[PDB]
């Protein structure tokens, strides 16, 4: 009765898409020249980790990059000189996500423990110590990126997300729309809206001001592993276990182009766009990463060399280089 | 040549590398295990045999030293029924101690399905599973009472026969022996269906009043380490 009505609405939404789906992105964008064959070479090999690396994030200066190892270590590597700057040991060994604050003064991390603990990097004494613990979730922290020097969003495995204040450490805005465990999130350039993917083959947009689900996107056949906004902020790519990446536009409210290949039957673990967005770097479980054409779906490059599953992939703010971290306990930077 | 800041940076990197190798020493010296099981499996009692923080905490660690070897057992706490995501985080643990209550014929199918899923998992294919058939006294009492038949849930039990490889304990009814060996073979068949020699199962008959569990865990971890060192060289 409220379940039948609901499905009716679905049809309506679907019908709306049928009114906006005039042509396909591959059709309208066919005359442009191809990107060619981008051959990215390895320039830096950061070694020293003990256990499998699980996450990383570049800094605003494009110099320091944080990486998390489930042995309980957050290492901040200087990508230029490869010199280890900070090595923070974690109380909880199982860490699954890390984030570098935009100001470069704090670094957040989380994992199986329901706490996205933050550590200060610019203490008056020069050492690192526990600054604040954001506890309260009933699931493992999938990702908690920094929105500002005071507010921080955190996605948990309890099918909900929460916005905390570093000062007080209390939930300021709660999001309980997702039905499955939230696996990844991606903020917008203006930090006003952010998309989040869950294990229900559905992505959801959320406004940090109001805190309500304004748009919901579907199309995937399995759990969405990675999600990353588009450099312009109007679209976002999502990679799931179905060995297929899908680009969804917020203004069109429908998938534009699909990235997949018969030879690829493995799930996606990482996704990232270049400074221009023409190239989409997606990490797969086949020990390699693929550089697809956002406007042509053509695989331009195959970054190989890793001996284990790719865990994280991060492009610099200036689109200069991309750092890929796998379970082999080594990171590789391609430029 | 280099700048004055480069010297300090290199010294800091050297100190951090020294700290990292010092930590790796202990990391390789200590072993890690993953405890799994249902609510009735009695994980609390086995965890309470550790003889050597937050309410919503999702992981509990227990460190115990046996024969000068440290073992850290990790058990998920506040977590939902879905486990296909975070379980992949334990694709490098030493062993997985899976508990089952052998006396509960109702949920025995659920335990078998969970064991099959954990065995056939893509990321857990290279990890051994230590099966502790806890609560043997309850199983013996239920078998001696005869109020619940096993063929109601597993018809093959009607055709099962006590294997000569068995080791009956002194003063044990043959019925209890055959029942426990059947519920052990139920898991061993699934284990061997996709073993491939890369991982094996270690079944043991344990109960609530049992202190040798630590010795069994130590011996199983030692055997797993021996097998790993053998496969590393290819002698395997």
């Amino acid at each position: 009765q409220l379940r039948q009505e609901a499905e009716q609405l679905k049809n309506q939404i679907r019908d709306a898409r049928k009114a906006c789906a005039d042509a396909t992105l591959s059709q309208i964008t066919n005359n442009i020249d191809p990107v060619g064959r981008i051959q990215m070479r390895t320039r830096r090999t950061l070694r020293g980790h003990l256990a499998k690396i699980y996450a990383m994030h570049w800094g605003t200066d494009s110099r320091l990059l944080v990486s998390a190892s489930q042995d309980g270590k957050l290492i901040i590597w200087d990508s230029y000189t490869t010199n280890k700057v900070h090595a923070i040991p974690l109380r909880s060994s199982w860490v699954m996500t890390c984030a570098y604050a935009p100001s470069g003064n704090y670094v957040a991390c989380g994992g199986l423990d329901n706490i996205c603990s933050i550590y200060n990097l610019k203490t008056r004494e020069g050492n690192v110590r526990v600054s604040r613990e954001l506890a309260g979730h009933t699931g493992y922290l999938s990702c908690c990126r920094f929105l500002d020097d005071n507010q921080i969003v955190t996605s948990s495995g309890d099918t909900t997300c929460a916005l905390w204040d570093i000062e007080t450490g209390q939930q300021t805005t709660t999001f309980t729309g997702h039905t499955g465990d939230v696996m990844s999130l991606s903020l917008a350039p203006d930090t006003r809206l952010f998309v989040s993917g869950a294990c229900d083959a559905s992505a959801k947009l959320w406004d940090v001001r109001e805190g309500m689900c304004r748009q919901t996107f579907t199309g995937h056949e399995s759990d969405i592993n990675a999600i990353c906004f588009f450099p312009n902020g109007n679209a976002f790519a999502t990679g799931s276990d179905d060995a297929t990446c899908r680009l969804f536009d917020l203004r069109a409210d429908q998938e534009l182009m699909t990235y997949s290949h018969d030879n690829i039957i493995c799930g996606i673990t990482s996704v990232s766009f270049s400074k221009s967005g023409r190239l989409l770097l997606a990490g797969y479980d086949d020990f390699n990463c693929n550089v697809w054409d956002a406007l042509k779906a053509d695989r331009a490059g195959v970054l190989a060399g890793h001996d284990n599953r790719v865990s994280c992939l991060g492009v610099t703010d200036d689109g200069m280089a991309v750092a890929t971290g796998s379970w082999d306990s080594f990171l590789k930077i391609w430029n | 040549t280099l700048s004055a800041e480069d010297k300090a940076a290199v010294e800091r990197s050297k100190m951090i590398e020294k700290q990292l190798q010092k930590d790796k020493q202990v990391y390789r010296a200590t072993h890690r295990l993953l405890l799994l099981g249902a609510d009735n499996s009695g994980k609390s009692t086995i965890v309470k045999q550790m003889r050597i923080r937050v309410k919503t905490s999702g992981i509990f660690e227990t460190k115990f030293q046996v024969d000068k070897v440290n073992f850290h057992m990790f058990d998920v706490g506040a977590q939902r029924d879905e486990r296909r995501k975070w379980i992949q985080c334990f694709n490098d643990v030493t062993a997985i101690i899976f508990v089952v209550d052998s006396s509960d014929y109702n949920r025995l199918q659920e335990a078998l399905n969970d064991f099959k899923s954990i065995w056939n998992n893509r990321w857990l294919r290279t990890i051994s599973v230590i099966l502790f058939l806890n609560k043997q006294d309850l199983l013996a009492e239920k078998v001696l009472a005869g109020k619940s038949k096993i063929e109601d849930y597993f018809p093959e039990f009607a055709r099962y026969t006590t294997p000569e490889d068995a080791t009956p304990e002194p003063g044990e009814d043959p019925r209890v022996t055959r029942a426990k060996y059947f519920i052990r073979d139920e898991f061993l068949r699934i284990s061997t269906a996709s073993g491939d020699g890369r991982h094996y199962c270690y079944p043991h008959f344990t109960c609530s009043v049992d202190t040798e569990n630590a010795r069994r865990i130590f011996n199983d971890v030692t055997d797993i380490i021996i097998k790993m060192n053998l496969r590393d060289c290819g002698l395997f």
Partner: nanobody
Framework: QVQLQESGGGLVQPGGSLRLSCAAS????????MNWVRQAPGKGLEWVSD????????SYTGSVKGRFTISRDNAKNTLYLQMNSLKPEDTAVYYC?????????????????????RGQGTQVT
């Protein structure tokens, strides 16, 4: 979107038979491992049977092993389940679950209370 609609459930006396049919949409039914579970009044999700992609590998729970037959139809992307020798214990809501990832033998969370890749099920009594 992923959708699984089950049909064929109804009232039947002991010893009868029922042909449950589940129609799937939103994914390649031929590249996913399927399972049939059941939940009875008061009890939890109980696994009934399981079938692979092509159908060569099939498994049934010992409680119903010998009277249930599961099958797939890729030409129509349908899951059929023929149940015979029904008994009062079979009164329950039957659901159909799909494996989380394709080309995987393991099927986790199939018996989980919350599972997105699962239909509404049909009540049999």
């Amino acid at each position: 979107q992923v959708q699984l609609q089950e049909s064929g459930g109804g009232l039947v006396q002991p010893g009868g038979s029922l042909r449950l049919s589940c129609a799937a949409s939103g994914f390649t039914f031929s590249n996913y491992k399927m399972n049939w579970v059941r939940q009875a009044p008061g009890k939890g999700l109980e696994w009934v049977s399981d079938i692979s992609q092509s159908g060569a590998s099939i498994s049934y729970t010992g409680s119903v092993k010998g009277r249930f037959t599961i099958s797939r139809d890729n030409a129509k992307n349908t899951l059929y389940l023929q149940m015979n020798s029904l008994k009062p214990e079979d009164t329950a809501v039957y659901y159909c679950a799909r494996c989380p990832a394709p080309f995987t033998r393991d099927c986790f969370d199939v018996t989980s209370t919350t599972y997105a890749y699962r239909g509404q099920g049909t009540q049999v009594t």
